[PDB]
Amino acid sequence: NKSDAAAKQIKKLEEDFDGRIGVFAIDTGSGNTFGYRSDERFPLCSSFKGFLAAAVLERVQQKKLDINQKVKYESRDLEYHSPITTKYKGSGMTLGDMASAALQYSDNGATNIIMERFLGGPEGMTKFMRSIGDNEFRLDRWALELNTAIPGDKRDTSTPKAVANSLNKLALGNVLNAKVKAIYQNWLKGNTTGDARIRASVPADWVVGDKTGSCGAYGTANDYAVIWPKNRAPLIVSIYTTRKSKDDKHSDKTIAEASRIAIQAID
Numbered sequence: 001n002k003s004d005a006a007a008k009q010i011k012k013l014e015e016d017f018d019g020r021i022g023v024f025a026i027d028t029g030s031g032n033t034f035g036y037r038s039d040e041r042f043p044l045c046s047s048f049k050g051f052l053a054a055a056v057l058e059r060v061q062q063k064k065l066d067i068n069q070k071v072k073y074e075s076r077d078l079e080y081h082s083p084i085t086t087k088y089k090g091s092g093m094t095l096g097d098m099a100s101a102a103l104q105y106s107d108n109g110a111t112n113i114i115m116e117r118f119l120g121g122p123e124g125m126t127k128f129m130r131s132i133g134d135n136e137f138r139l140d141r142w143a144l145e146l147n148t149a150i151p152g153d154k155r156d157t158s159t160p161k162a163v164a165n166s167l168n169k170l171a172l173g174n175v176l177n178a179k180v181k182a183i184y185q186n187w188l189k190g191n192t193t194g195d196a197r198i199r200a201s202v203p204a205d206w207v208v209g210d211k212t213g214s215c216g217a218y219g220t221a222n223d224y225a226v227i228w229p230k231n232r233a234p235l236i237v238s239i240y241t242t243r244k245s246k247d248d249k250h251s252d253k254t255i256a257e258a259s260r261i262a263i264q265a266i267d
């Protein structure tokens, strides 16, 4: 009933821009959920970078990597959209700066380097997600090839629900200890790419951490967030969208709107 009216609104919203919306929201205080197409598969785009940083911090926490070890890449041809790694090319970067660059600026060079050197590539990112008990998450290709968002292709996809559950386990749950979890949160809170998305759907004084993605094809874009309202339990929102035509552009306002409707369904 509270659920069916949110579903109506989302359905309207997806018809309005002539595409498809996936939502999954959790109130971690009360347990209440809301989903819409929350078990259907959606391209990840960059959004998986958020889990990559947590994979790295898991390795830090088990002392299989040091967060301050230098990572040198002086000879590499940096991928397009490496705004952060390009500037540090000569000096290298700390593993931790590199990971958070991956997350906070969606840096493709940061992404590819970490996956090649420390993570066992796409297969090993997928392995990290099975290990927390995400079974829907799949990664197949590398940073710049995973964006084709072709309807029906399952490469590089997850579901809204599965993303939410993962983020809940990683941000709020028990894979990371106190200390490392707070690093991970601070990383999410400093994400720079999501001002117009989930961040836009909540009051100004609520703290938000998020990771976005935009494929640039099939209007495909997404965002997921942990939300800390004033004097109340944290929320998880996970919003994924695709559009009918190859040439359609993403719509941030739709994401922000789908988020408002979702925060309202669990309120």
Ligand SMILES: *C(=O)[C@@H]([C@@H]1N=C(C(=O)O)[C@@H](S[C@@H]2CN[C@H](CNS(N)(=O)=O)C2)[C@@H]1C)[C@@H](C)O
Pocket: 045, 046, 047, 081, 105, 106, 108, 143, 144, 147, 192, 193, 194, 195, 196, 212, 213, 214, 215
């Ligand atoms: C991943 O999807 C790609 C990479 N990451 C992006 C992202 O949104 O995470 C895209 S979009 C890009 C990020 N900064 C701008 C949006 N913020 S803003 N200027 O405040 O509107 C544009 C970017 C392409 C990668 C795989 O291409």
